[PDB]
Design an enzyme around this catalytic site. Structure first.
Site, PDB file in Angstrom:
ATOM      1  N   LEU A 340     -54.062  63.795  40.130  1.00 22.67           N
ATOM      2  CA  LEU A 340     -55.120  63.876  39.182  1.00 22.67           C
ATOM      3  C   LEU A 340     -56.279  63.036  39.485  1.00 22.67           C
ATOM      4  O   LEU A 340     -57.236  63.184  38.939  1.00 22.67           O
ATOM      5  CB  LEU A 340     -54.680  64.037  37.801  1.00 22.67           C
ATOM      6  N   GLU A 365     -29.394  55.083  26.253  1.00 21.25           N
ATOM      7  CA  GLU A 365     -28.046  55.823  26.409  1.00 21.25           C
ATOM      8  C   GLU A 365     -27.425  55.093  27.718  1.00 21.25           C
ATOM      9  O   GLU A 365     -26.867  56.032  28.183  1.00 21.25           O
ATOM     10  CB  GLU A 365     -28.201  57.239  26.479  1.00 21.25           C
TER      11      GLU A 365
END
Ligand SMILES: CC(=O)CC(=O)SCCNC(=O)CCNC(=O)[C@H](O)C(C)(C)COP(=O)(O)OP(=O)(O)OC[C@H]1O[C@@H](n2cnc3c(N)ncnc32)[C@H](O)[C@@H]1OP(=O)(O)O
Ligand SMILES: CC(=O)CC(=O)SCCNC(=O)CCNC(=O)[C@H](O)C(C)(C)COP(=O)(O)OP(=O)(O)OC[C@H]1O[C@@H](n2cnc3c(N)ncnc32)[C@H](O)[C@@H]1OP(=O)(O)O
Ligand SMILES: CC(=O)CC(=O)SCCNC(=O)CCNC(=O)[C@H](O)C(C)(C)COP(=O)(O)OP(=O)(O)OC[C@H]1O[C@@H](n2cnc3c(N)ncnc32)[C@H](O)[C@@H]1OP(=O)(O)O
Ligand SMILES: CC(=O)CC(=O)SCCNC(=O)CCNC(=O)[C@H](O)C(C)(C)COP(=O)(O)OP(=O)(O)OC[C@H]1O[C@@H](n2cnc3c(N)ncnc32)[C@H](O)[C@@H]1OP(=O)(O)O
Ligand SMILES: Cc1cc2nc3c(=O)[nH]c(=O)nc-3n(C[C@H](O)[C@H](O)[C@H](O)COP(=O)(O)OP(=O)(O)OC[C@H]3O[C@@H](n4cnc5c(N)ncnc54)[C@H](O)[C@@H]3O)c2cc1C
Ligand SMILES: Cc1cc2nc3c(=O)[nH]c(=O)nc-3n(C[C@H](O)[C@H](O)[C@H](O)COP(=O)(O)OP(=O)(O)OC[C@H]3O[C@@H](n4cnc5c(N)ncnc54)[C@H](O)[C@@H]3O)c2cc1C
Ligand SMILES: Cc1cc2nc3c(=O)[nH]c(=O)nc-3n(C[C@H](O)[C@H](O)[C@H](O)COP(=O)(O)OP(=O)(O)OC[C@H]3O[C@@H](n4cnc5c(N)ncnc54)[C@H](O)[C@@H]3O)c2cc1C
Ligand SMILES: Cc1cc2nc3c(=O)[nH]c(=O)nc-3n(C[C@H](O)[C@H](O)[C@H](O)COP(=O)(O)OP(=O)(O)OC[C@H]3O[C@@H](n4cnc5c(N)ncnc54)[C@H](O)[C@@H]3O)c2cc1C
Lengths: 384, 384, 384, 384
Positions: A340, A365
């Site tokens: 972009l 986690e």
């Protein structure tokens, strides 16, 4: 934009439904949720009605009666719309309901599961502490038994959903002389006397979700709030994390997919040197590497989800999916910003948000370093 | 720190001055600047007084009378303290004063260089437009000679320092059909009739600096504001960027060094599984790789600076430095977050800001893909 | 050492059988085959009897009557024993029999397929030429029609099995004015008047297989040797390569598996600093990355094989498997040498041979750069 | 070529001499040396005459009287012509003469340095053993003082130049219970009673050099053959390797440069899809990355050399150079093969040999993992 062998019609329909929901309810507000650090109250409720918050829970307990393959596909589509909503959903499914459903008694299932399957109430998971996260067994929070109740003392850190949850599965030391073998899991209602919430954390990504400490000061709970047997705490947290890691891998695939979608669409419309960016060999190679990484990560994730459904060991597979998916999310979201150009650095486009949201998947986690240790342990065990 | 061959006392001494400055004036306020998107007015003036805003400018014109090696060293130390302040400084040095000093007439140097050396006023560089960045020669902004005046029309995009500058060097076409051979450079005072600023861009990083469009609507400037010869504009833009890229390489080195310092310091204090993180082999390997990439990119940067000072070609060497340093800053800042774990995802620590600031170095003043093209072009030219 | 969901018992048995064969017939002679550049005559024959040389061919034509999922699993196990034997098998299956079975007439199937299903005769594929390999459509070899026969002229390059084959599928230009749309496929017996074999190539790896040019000088063949319709040549080569690439991906998985096996076994027995290498955190991380790369590549490969079996488009999936598998083979075989240290550099161990054999998988049947172009083309097409 | 800051005329001139030498004496025979595993006797003598086998040795002792910067530059040019010849040269310079020059007595320097400076005789370095390489302090070879003589017993492994050397510097323990503090260094003439050579090792690369075990069976050497103080052996080994690693860094730079030269030259002549390969963007990007990694690693190497010459600490800088250069040589030589395509896999071109020779630079004189450990250790020491 990926082709699978023969997916059950039930799962294909499920995918379509969640994609539409994310496209209709999440995509248009994701930016404002991130900017204002606003919990998506209404969206979570609608999700609950669709049964997205209790996908693995059987019909009898008011669950969706589906499986983990369905859960992974639905979580990817949702996370593609909003990474925060995705983790809020993953936590209630894998971390809260998951362990209660697997280790809880008939009674515990009825009072702690059923009330958290429709979106009115969601839970959280409290394992980490300020002094330890990776070193899970070093739990410092304690639980003393006082006849017909337990007394909790200590601080839990980084709790997702802490400011919106109505219950939590907390891990505390009940026997310090056995260390990581002297930990037990407890069900605690929220609010409750003796439990205090820390200030909300200001973070880089998934800013719509709440993250805070849980301070326990002589917090008393009934003796029956003990989940499983005394000293079973570590094993419960570990098996629970095996399930959750499949959820985080799924959230990662969603962020990566949104990143690839944005990059492709922009490259076909943006011109440079008299032609779309998709005419530049370099841009093609990037998109090729991004797609490969994503589709590879999805297959690993699906394998793990299916092994769990078939009741086969999946700890290694779960760790591999989580690792590959999270690392793919950062790389892919990074290249989306690159493709972009200047537009990739400003808040007008969602590319920078994808980059910020992806970074957390490599940490919580279980950090990537820990997933690698887990994989090696099982890999070597299979060779022994 | 790193061990250098044998720097002259002036440069070794300058390094200390800039590091002490950054440590005392920038480090303690960097978080606030980023959070409030606050331009550091007081600090820029101080740096001006120290002579850091016009390092390569001779004393006769009120400059510090140093060289690009000193510029690089000073810019790294400043950027380590605050990445925004560093780019504000780099723009004034390389992009504004650089072109005027190299192609300006004796009179233009007195009028446009002198008033911009003490920090009261700074300049900006306007080359890019909404429709083109990498494709620099496709400028749509026009300039027509109305006898004793030039009249400019068009929109320049992404201009750094736009909201705080008092002058700009704009590139406009005098004959759009001649493409990149019809470009000319002009000096425009700010503010001035016919020139309005676009709204500030909200971005991922280097948020203390301003970025906005410059809109020209029949903006008239004296005939003598032409910098160089008509149609020499593209060449002026290209040679200016060769100097500017050494500047961005230096800024990236600063973000990367600040990141490493943060990772080491945290790694020695944080304990996991009984000992400091630095006892874990994996942690040691990451630090080693981080150090190698940084010192390696610094040598490339210093090389480009010295070639520039010796009046040797340095386009290729300048592109290599900017490329290697920018990519190192993102890799190193990424790993710093990982090493801090949960603490690296929250604003309480500076690691997340380093990650954000580092990301822009791979995009502006020529994306990594452009750098690679420039490198390949000169490499091939050496073999033919 | 990898866990799959629910593989059919037919395929599990097939895997066991091929592993035993490779372990009994290939492992002990692989080194001597590589050193002497000796074609494994006896082994290929035994393989044919097992039906490994015509796995996809139906029973009616004297084939094994299996599918591509079976083919991939069997090819991996064989390649794990000897990469050369693996490609010799892949060529006869995917490149020779493959196109005849798909485009040939009932008669062609009977005379060119049946005699090449038991190991007494094997075929080869001739598409590449000295002046072009990647640029497939630039075929310079021509075929003129002379009533009831074709006359071939030109040179074909890098033909695998050329010195042992009894037939070849050659691609020649029949209409130069249509370029890549003026190519046709032909079945040519070997030997035959007008066909000459070039000198055997001395190569880095898979030295047991033969590689040479095919020189055609007024080589006449019956008009009926034309495969498919005139001008259908390019499409046939491309669809044939989609099948073959699944075969090369499988060979790569086998080389990678042998590399991982060697590394793990050596690391558990080799001591350094008072303990097995498997106690070093760094070695664990490596083995983790190696396993991940391999299991990811296998899933991609299996997906492609299954899509082919289900009669679904698989060009992109095939390219992804080939790319990922080949790149994984070089990385994994590279780390195997590293983990072995000095022992990894000498011919006493098979690690260096794995490294040499793996390098070719990144080149033939389409270089990694070409696979990336193929992937991007299909990826973008799905977005259009 | 590459552009350097400003080398003294002596070094610039030396570069030309060595490049012309390599171009005329080595390049044309490199293929034969590798294929026949032929030690280049005539060429080593010539290099001896040029003073390249004792560059850092003062003229008083018959050395060339240069420095390590010149050594690095000369070794790169030689290694570009033949990687084996380069390591033969590096061993004599850094591993044999280096330790004797630094720790030898006036008499030892006359006896063991002078006769080894003209190419008639060369030496070797014996530290490693079958059971330990990375773990250098676990030497099992013993040395006991029998009054006027030392008696050595044990086996040294992997000794380069073993079959052509006339002297060796061996490291043996005088008290195995004291571990790495009981090691001493000895000078042993070759051949000599009690010392036999193991058979030549057949290896992947640098095949023109010899590698074999040295077997000591009650080998007696005069008491004065002790190099340094008793128990100072480990320190002598470590400081010697700091010098030797700059040497291996230089050899790797040579293999990498030869590889790039081959890739560029071939890329400009070979046509694909109508134009030279150099017109393909992807090809341009690879060359750019190859160039960056090589020039970058050269600066690290030159830095270490200059620090050594200025008598500054250079252990960390030396490890960085060896690491970055060795890994660049494998990456660059790997890509050179890819760019040549099919031609890169056959012996007709030199690319495959470069790949093979490059592989050893990541293993000997300390593996990449060891380099990383050394780097991390010194880095941390700088912050504490
Ligand atoms: C929404 C969110 O953001 C959620 C949050 O992140 S949740 C918090 C996440 N935290 C983590 O994932 C922590 C990462 N750490 C871990 O997973 C582990 O602590 C670890 C892999 C490092 C291992 O820890 P350890 O203290 O070394 O224990 P270790 O010796 O491996 O294991 C101890 C016992 O647990 C058992 N165990 C480990 N993993 C297990 C599993 N998956 N299932 C069952 N038992 C398991 C072991 O077999 C062992 O049992 P015995 O020896 O009694 O047979
Ligand atoms: C604070 C900030 O953040 C600042 C901003 O970023 S500033 C804006 C940054 N933008 C860029 O860096 C743009 C990147 N693009 C470029 O550098 C160039 O456009 C490019 C490398 C892509 C080449 O563009 P191009 O249109 O293909 O031109 P190209 O054919 O290479 O060159 C045209 C002419 O310029 C000349 N030229 C190019 N680079 C040159 C250099 N470094 N020095 C001198 N002349 C140069 C060429 O020799 C050629 O001359 P002639 O044809 O007249 O003989
Ligand atoms: C044992 C061994 O070692 C074996 C050897 O390696 S075998 C030799 C291996 N060589 C290769 O793999 C060559 C690599 N090159 C290719 O695959 C191709 O040449 C390429 C991808 C570069 C494309 O080539 P191209 O000349 O640009 O053609 P392109 O424009 O893409 O395609 C032309 C036509 O073929 C068709 N085509 C391409 N791939 C196709 C496929 N998989 N199936 C059907 N049709 C296909 C296109 O659709 C197009 O048809 P229309 O335009 O008529 O509809
Ligand atoms: C042609 C060829 O190909 C040549 C061959 O390869 S040559 C053989 C190559 N082998 C190697 O390079 C081996 C790699 N291993 C090493 O470099 C080391 O063994 C090592 C980095 C792993 C460290 O080993 P270790 O046993 O842990 O020792 P460590 O605790 O670091 O050091 C022990 C002592 O040596 C000293 N030491 C280490 N490196 C030193 C250096 N560069 N300079 C001076 N002293 C040094 C330490 O300061 C320490 O001193 P005290 O304890 O007496 O105060
Ligand atoms: C947004 C967010 C949300 C979270 N939500 C929750 C939640 O809901 N519930 C909950 O219980 N926790 C939650 N956490 C905590 C999370 O699980 C921990 O942050 C994570 O596990 C890392 O632990 P740590 O932060 O203590 O880092 P540390 O454990 O201090 O680790 C620091 C670094 O050292 C490395 N390291 C540690 N041990 C080893 C080892 N043995 N070998 C090699 N390297 C090692 C790590 O990989 C990391 O790079 C959250 C964190 C964040 C940022
Ligand atoms: C914070 C910020 C500040 C800026 N400040 C300034 C300033 O002060 N002055 C100024 O003049 N400009 C400034 N810019 C603009 C900057 O120079 C451009 O953003 C940059 O050059 C890329 O141009 P672009 O954004 O138009 O992207 P595009 O040119 O549209 O490119 C998009 C993607 O395509 C790739 N690409 C394009 N052409 C090619 C090619 N030929 N080969 C391979 N890949 C290619 C690019 O590498 C990129 O990956 C700024 C930008 C930012 C984000
Ligand atoms: C051991 C071996 C066995 C072989 N066996 C066979 C066989 O049995 N049958 C057969 O028909 N062929 C066979 N080949 C040939 C093989 O298919 C070609 O070598 C391969 O396709 C590459 O073609 P090339 O060698 O002409 O390289 P080139 O096509 O010259 O390519 C050189 C480089 O340029 C790159 N390149 C080319 N075109 C592009 C593009 N458009 N975009 C970007 N990069 C590009 C390539 O990726 C490569 O890196 C064999 C080769 C080897 C080494
Ligand atoms: C061609 C060739 C020539 C040689 N010439 C000489 C010579 O002239 N003189 C001489 O003395 N020696 C020589 N050697 C030996 C060389 O120094 C050793 O091969 C090298 O140091 C590695 O030791 P090793 O082979 O025993 O491997 P090991 O030490 O067994 O190591 C195996 C693997 O474990 C890793 N490892 C070991 N310890 C650690 C650790 N603490 N942390 C992390 N990873 C670790 C290594 O990095 C490697 O990846 C030569 C070797 C070769 C191949």
């Amino acid at each position: 934009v990926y082709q699978s062998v023969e997916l059950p019609e039930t799962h294909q329909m499920l995918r379509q439904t969640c994609r539409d929901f994310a496209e209709k309810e999440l995509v248009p507000i994701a930016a404002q949720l991130d900017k204002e650090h606003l919990f998506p109250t209404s969206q979570v409720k609608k999700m609950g009605e669709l049964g997205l918050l209790a996908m693995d829970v059987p019909e009898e307990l008011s669950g969706a009666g589906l499986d983990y393959l369905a859960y992974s596909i639905a979580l990817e589509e949702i996370s593609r719309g909003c990474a925060s909503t995705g983790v809020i959903m993953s936590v209630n499914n894998s971390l809260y309901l998951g362990p209660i459903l697997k280790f809880g008694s008939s009674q515990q299932k009825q009072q702690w599961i059923t009330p958290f399957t429709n979106g009115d109430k969601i839970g959280c998971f409290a394992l980490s502490e300020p002094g330890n996260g990776s070193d899970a067994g070093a739990a410092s929070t304690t639980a003393r038994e006082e006849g017909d109740s337990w007394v909790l003392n200590g601080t839990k850190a980084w709790i997702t959903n802490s400011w919106e949850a109505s219950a939590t599965v907390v891990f505390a030391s009940t026997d310090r002389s056995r260390q990581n073998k002297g930990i037990s899991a407890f069900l605690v209602p929220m609010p409750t006397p003796g439990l205090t919430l820390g200030k909300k954390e200001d973070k880089l990504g998934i800013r719509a979700s709440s993250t805070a400490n849980l301070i326990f000061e002589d917090c008393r709970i009934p003796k029956e709030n003990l989940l499983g047997e005394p000293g079973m705490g570590f094993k419960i947290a570990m098996q629970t994390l095996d399930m959750g890691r499949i959820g985080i891998a799924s959230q990662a695939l969603g962020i990566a997919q949104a990143s690839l979608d944005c990059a492709v669409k922009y490259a076909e419309n943006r011109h440079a040197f008299g032609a779309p960016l998709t005419k530049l060999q370099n841009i093609q190679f990037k998109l090729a590497d991004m797609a490969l990484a994503l589709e590879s990560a999805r297959l690993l994730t699906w394998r793990a989800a299916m092994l769990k459904d078939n009741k086969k060991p999946f700890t290694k597979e779960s760790a591999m999916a989580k690792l590959a998916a999270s690392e793919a999310a950062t790389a892919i979201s990074h290249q989306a910003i690159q493709i972009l150009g200047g537009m990739g650095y400003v808040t007008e486009m969602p590319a920078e948000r994808y980059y910020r949201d992806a970074r957390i998947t490599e940490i919580y986690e279980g950090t990537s370093e820990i997933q690698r240790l887990v994989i090696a342990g099982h890999l070597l065990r299979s060779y022994r």
